[PDB]
Ligand binder design. Sequence first.
Ligand SMILES: Nc1nc(=O)c2nc(CNc3ccc(C(=O)N[C@@H](CCC(=O)O)C(=O)O)cc3)cnc2[nH]1
Ligand SMILES: [Ca+2]
Ligand SMILES: [Cl-]
Ligand SMILES: [Cl-]
Ligand SMILES: [Cl-]
Length: 159
Amino acid sequence: MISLIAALAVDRVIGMENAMPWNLPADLAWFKRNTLDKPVIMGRHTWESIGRPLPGRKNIILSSQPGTDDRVTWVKSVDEAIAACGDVPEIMVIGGGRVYEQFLPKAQKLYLTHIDAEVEGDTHFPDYEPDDWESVFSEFHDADAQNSHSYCFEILERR
Ligand SMILES: Nc1nc(=O)c2nc(CNc3ccc(C(=O)N[C@@H](CCC(=O)O)C(=O)O)cc3)cnc2[nH]1
Ligand SMILES: [Ca+2]
Ligand SMILES: [Cl-]
Ligand SMILES: [Cl-]
Ligand SMILES: [Cl-]
């Protein structure tokens, strides 16, 4: 099964010209909880944003240009990315925009963090149809001493 995991500001904003203007360690802990010991597929801009390989996960970079880091796996097609995951119960697609757009039709599950932030977006999560998805988990949190915005965790399963 292929799953997508993303953090969405209002209007499904996922990326901006520069780093996103929030500080959400609790969302990064949720990201880690749901990706640990699973292969993760990402695009090159997300790879640069993270800075280093994500620990405890097989890091696969989908890109048309050859790779510039030996600590991860570089693939050039969606099918090569999936084959590089081997035989695993769940593949995690972690963005960004174009990578979400390519993997959404194959995905059966979405892990979404909805962030109460009004920002002008550079890239957006795909306009999925909520009629077509079933929320099986939702958990709301206010901003606090460590987290700058209110956020809601959601898991959605393809109806
Ligand atoms: N829910 C969600 N939130 C995100 O911030 C997110 N970010 C990306 C792309 N960007 C990033 C940026 C940083 C890290 C990261 O550093 N994660 C660490 C935990 C952070 C920490 O320990 O300080 C990890 O080990 O997973 C992951 C993805 C893709 N899907 C997401 N999904
Ligand atoms: Ca429900
Ligand atoms: Cl968590
Ligand atoms: Cl990307
Ligand atoms: Cl629902």
